[PDB]
Amino acid sequence: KIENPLKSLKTALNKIVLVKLKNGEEYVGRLEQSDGTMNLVLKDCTEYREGTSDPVAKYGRVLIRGSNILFISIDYESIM
Amino acid sequence: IENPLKSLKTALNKIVLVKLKNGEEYVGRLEQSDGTMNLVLKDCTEYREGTSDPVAKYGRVLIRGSNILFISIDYESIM
Amino acid sequence: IENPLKSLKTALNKIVLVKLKNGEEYVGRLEQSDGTMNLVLKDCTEYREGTSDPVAKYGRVLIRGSNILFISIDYESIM
Amino acid sequence: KIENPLKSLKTALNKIVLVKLKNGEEYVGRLEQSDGTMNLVLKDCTEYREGTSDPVAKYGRVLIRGSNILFISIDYESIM
Amino acid sequence: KIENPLKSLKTALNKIVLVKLKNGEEYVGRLEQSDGTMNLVLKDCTEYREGTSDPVAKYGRVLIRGSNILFISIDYESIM
Amino acid sequence: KIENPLKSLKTALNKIVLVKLKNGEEYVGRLEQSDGTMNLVLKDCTEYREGTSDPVAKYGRVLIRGSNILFISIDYESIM
Amino acid sequence: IENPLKSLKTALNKIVLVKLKNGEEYVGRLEQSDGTMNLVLKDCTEYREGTSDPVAKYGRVLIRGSNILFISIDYESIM
Numbered sequence: 001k002i003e004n005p006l007k008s009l010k011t012a013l014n015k016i017v018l019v020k021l022k023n024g025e026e027y028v029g030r031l032e033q034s035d036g037t038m039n040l041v042l043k044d045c046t047e048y049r050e051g052t053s054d055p056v057a058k059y060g061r062v063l064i065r066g067s068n069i070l071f072i073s074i075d076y077e078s079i080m
Numbered sequence: 081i082e083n084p085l086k087s088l089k090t091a092l093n094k095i096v097l098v099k100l101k102n103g104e105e106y107v108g109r110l111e112q113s114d115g116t117m118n119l120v121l122k123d124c125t126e127y128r129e130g131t132s133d134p135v136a137k138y139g140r141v142l143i144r145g146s147n148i149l150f151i152s153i154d155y156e157s158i159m
Numbered sequence: 160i161e162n163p164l165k166s167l168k169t170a171l172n173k174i175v176l177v178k179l180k181n182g183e184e185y186v187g188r189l190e191q192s193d194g195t196m197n198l199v200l201k202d203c204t205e206y207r208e209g210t211s212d213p214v215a216k217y218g219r220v221l222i223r224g225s226n227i228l229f230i231s232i233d234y235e236s237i238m
Numbered sequence: 239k240i241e242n243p244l245k246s247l248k249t250a251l252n253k254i255v256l257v258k259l260k261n262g263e264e265y266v267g268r269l270e271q272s273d274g275t276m277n278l279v280l281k282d283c284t285e286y287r288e289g290t291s292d293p294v295a296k297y298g299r300v301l302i303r304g305s306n307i308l309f310i311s312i313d314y315e316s317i318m
Numbered sequence: 319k320i321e322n323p324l325k326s327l328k329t330a331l332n333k334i335v336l337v338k339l340k341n342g343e344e345y346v347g348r349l350e351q352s353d354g355t356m357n358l359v360l361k362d363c364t365e366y367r368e369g370t371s372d373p374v375a376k377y378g379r380v381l382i383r384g385s386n387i388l389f390i391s392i393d394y395e396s397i398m
Numbered sequence: 399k400i401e402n403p404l405k406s407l408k409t410a411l412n413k414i415v416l417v418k419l420k421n422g423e424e425y426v427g428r429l430e431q432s433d434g435t436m437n438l439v440l441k442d443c444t445e446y447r448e449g450t451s452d453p454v455a456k457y458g459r460v461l462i463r464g465s466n467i468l469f470i471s472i473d474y475e476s477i478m
Numbered sequence: 479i480e481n482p483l484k485s486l487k488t489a490l491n492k493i494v495l496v497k498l499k500n501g502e503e504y505v506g507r508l509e510q511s512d513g514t515m516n517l518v519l520k521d522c523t524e525y526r527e528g529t530s531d532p533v534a535k536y537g538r539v540l541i542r543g544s545n546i547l548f549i550s551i552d553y554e555s556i557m
Contacts, residue, residue, distance in 0.1 A: 004112060004114050004118075005112050005113070005114055005118040005119060005120050005142050006118070008112060008120050008140075008142055018138065022101070022102070022147065024102060051126070051135045051136040066144075067146075069144050070100055070102075070143070070144060070147050071106075071138070071142060072141065072142045073124075073138045073139050073140070074120075074139075074140050075139040076138075076139060078139065079137065079138075079139040
C-alpha cells in the first residue's frame with residue numbers, strides 16, 4: 001500500500017485545516033494548495049490563540065512556509 | 081537487522097506519545113510514518129508537558145519530524 | 160499548473176502582509192520575489208503583531224525568505 | 239587506530255545512559271539502539287529535572303531524535 | 319528583464335542600510351560588500367534599539383552572517 | 399605549516415577543555431576524542447554555571463554533539 | 479577580488495569582537511578562520527552584551543561559525 005504522511009496532506013484539499021507553527025500560533029483556513037515542502041496556501045485564514053477559539057486576526061489568503069510548521073490538523077472541519 | 085527508525089514501525093496502529101521541541105506532548109494512535117519521522121496520528125490530544133492534563137483536541141494530525149524530540153513508541157503499554 | 164510558490168507571483172505589485180519568525184508583521188507593496196521567497200517590498204511599514212498599530216517605517220526592504228512565517232498574498236483587497 | 243566519538247556510543251549499548259536534550263531536560267534509561275545520526279532508542283526511560291534526581295515523568299521505550307541531543311553520558315551506569 | 323531580490327542588494331552598495339537580525343536588533347552602516355548568501359560588510363556600524371534612534375553600541379567594520387538577517391532596508395539613507 | 403580551526407582542536411587532545419553549549423551551559427573535562435563535526439568525548443565532565451566556577455552536576459564520560467557547541471576553550475587547562 | 483569572506487581573512491592577527499546568536503560578545507585576537515567562519519581567538523574575554531563589563535576569560539577558543547551573528551573585524555580601533 002502506498003500511503004505516507006505527505007499524501008495524507010493531499011486528501012485535505014479544499015477542506016478546513018488547522019496549522020500550528022513553531023511559535024505555537026494556530027491558523028485555520030481552507031487548504032487550497034500544498035507542495036512537497038508542506039508549503040501551504042490557505043483560504044480565509046484566521047489566527048487563533050493557542051489551544052483556544054479566540055480569534056486574533058484575519059489574514060485572508062496566506063502562503064505558509066512548511067519549514068516552520070509543527071503540525072497540520074487535516075480533518076479539522078469534522079471536529080470544529 | 082535493527083535500527084531506531086525500524087522501531088518506529090513497530091508502533092504502527094498503537095498509541096504513542098510524541099514530544100515536540102517546544103516541550104508540548106501529543107498522544108494519539110500512530111497511523112503513518114516516514115524516514116524523516118513525519119507522522120500521522122489519529123485522535124490526537126495535546127497534554128501539558130509532564131502531566132495528564134489535556135489542553136486541546138486536534139483530530140487526525142500530520143506532525144513534521146524535524147520538530148520532534150522523542151516518540152514514546154510503547155506508550156500504550158504504560159498507561 | 161498551480162502550486163504555493165506560483166501563488167506568490169500573483170501578488171506582484173500588490174500590497175502584502177509578511178509575518179516573520181519573531182511574530183513581527185510587515186506591510187508593503189511586493190516588487191520582487193524569487194524561488195527561495197526572498198522578497199523586495201516598497202513603502203514597508205512594520206506593525207505590532209495582530210494589530211494596525213504602526214511601529215516603524217523601513218522604506219524599500221529586502222526580506223530573507225528563510226525567516227518568513229507566512230505571506231498574506233491578498234492583503235490589499237482586505238486591509 | 240580506529241577510535242572516534244560515535245564508536246564510543248557503541249560501547250554503551252545495553253548500559254544505562256543519561257541523555258540531555260536541547261531544552262535541558264535529562265532522560266535516563268538503557269540504551270538499546272543507536273545509529274550514525276545519534277538517533278537513540280532507550281528502554282525504561284525516566285525524565286529527571288535538569289541537574290537533579292527528581293523524576294518528572296515516565297515514558298517507557300523512547301525513540302530520541304539525534305539532532306536535539308546535547309550530550310550522552312555513556313558511563314552513567316557506573317556512577318549513579 | 320532580470321529583476322531579482324538579491325540583485326537589488328547590489329544597488330545599495332556604498333549606501334547606508336539598516337539590517338535587522340533575527341533577535342530583533344537593528345544595525346545601521348554603509349554597505350561595502352555583499353555576496354549571494356547575503357553575508358554583508360558594513361562600515362561604521364552602530365546598533366540601535368529596535369524601532370528607535372537610541373544608539374546602543376558601536377561596532378565599526380562588521381561582517382554580518384546572512385542566515386540571521388531578517389531584512390535589509392536597502393534605501394535607508396534616503397529616509398534617514 | 400598547515401593551520402586551520404579544526405586542526406587546532408586536535409592540539410587539545412588529552413587536555414582539559416571547556417565546552418560552552420548553545421543554551422549557555424559550560425562543561426569541563428579532559429578531551430579524549432573528537433571528529434570532523436566537532437563531536438567530542440570528554441572524561442570526568444563537570445557542568446558549571448555559565449561564566450562561574452560553581453559546579454552544577456557531574457556526568458562522567460560524555461559524548462557531546464558538535465552541532466550544539468558554541469565554542470571550545472582549547473587551552474583551558476593552562477588557565478584554570 | 480573583494481568579498482565578505484575575504485574580508486574575514488584580512489582580520490587575521492587583529493583584535494575582533496564576535497557576537498553570537500544569544501547576544502554574548504567575545505573579544506580576542508583572531509588567529510585562524512575558515513570558509514564556514516569557524517574562528518580561533520587568542521586571549522578571549524566574554525563581555526556583557528553592549529557593555530564593557532567582562533564576564534569571564536576563556537583563553538584560546540575555537541568558535542563555531544554557525545552561531546555567529548557578526549564579527550567586528552576592526553574592533554581594536556573601537557575599544
